């Protein structure tokens, strides 16, 4: 295949809700070992979010049956949870190695938006690993999630407008990280509130090509703040 054909396959796979196909095409595109265009970046993220998501869903269901069920069935439930878990971990590692070995690694200096987009993805996929991890393994992935979000945050503060959708979406997930993973509801509300306030303070920084995305994520920040407070 050529690159155009892989990307066309990803677009078709998306429409067909065949997300394993979509992710495999976008991984192949990444493995051509060149930067991704905005569209390629978005296709990659959409593909893997869908793959990790279903299971992020299946794991919650089987974990819940496990908690309600736990007679000894229990062996099965537990085995099946662990199978789903291992799939979910392998998906995350699949993305994290694309990020570490290609996308972050080779991102050019002036491509701040890409940098922040990939560091946020790195935070996200360590956070998905943290959702299922326990013990010392949890401590490690939690540290790695926060390190990735923190670096994304520093770059975005320096190089992007407070209204930029990628900066706003980062604040959204970083604050979810504080709320849900670290159970630090003050640190979560402060981050969300700050990101919202800073965007509001600068509506004049909305872009004619992205203002709908900016305002949508502003509302998402607000929705979380309201829930949490």
């Amino acid at each position: 295949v050529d690159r155009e054909q892989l990307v066309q396959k990803a677009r078709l796979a998306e429409q067909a809700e065949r997300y394993d196909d979509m992710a495999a095409a976008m991984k192949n595109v990444t493995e051509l070992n060149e930067p991704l265009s905005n569209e390629e970046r978005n296709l990659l993220s959409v593909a893997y979010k869908n793959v990790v998501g279903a299971r992020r869903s299946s794991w919650r269901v089987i974990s819940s049956i496990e908690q309600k069920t736990s007679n000894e069935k229990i062996e099965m439930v537990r085995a099946y949870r662990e199978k789903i878990e291992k799939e979910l971990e392998a998906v995350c590692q699949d993305v994290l190695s694309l990020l570490d070995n290609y996308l972050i690694k080779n991102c050019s200096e002036t491509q701040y938006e890409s940098k922040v987009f990939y560091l946020k993805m790195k935070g996200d996929y360590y956070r998905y690993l943290a959702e299922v991890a326990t013990g010392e393994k949890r401590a490690t992935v939690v540290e790695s999630s926060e390190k990735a979000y923190s670096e994304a945050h520093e770059i975005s503060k320096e190089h992007m407008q407070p209204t930029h959708p990628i900066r706003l979406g980062l604040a959204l997930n970083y604050s979810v990280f504080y709320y849900e993973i670290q159970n630090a509801p003050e640190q979560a509300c402060h981050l969300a509130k700050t990101a919202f306030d800073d965007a509001i303070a600068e509506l004049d920084t909305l872009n004619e090509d992205s203002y709908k995305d900016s305002t949508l994520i502003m509302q998402l920040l607000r929705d979380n703040l309201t829930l949490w407070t």
């Binding site: 998306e14 993220s45 979010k49 996200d124 997930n173 709320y179 829930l227």
Partner: peptide, 9 residues
């Protein structure tokens, strides 16, 4: 969840 909605293509 409370996290960012997946991108619309």
């Amino acid at each position: 969840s409370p996290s960012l909605p997946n991108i619309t293509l």
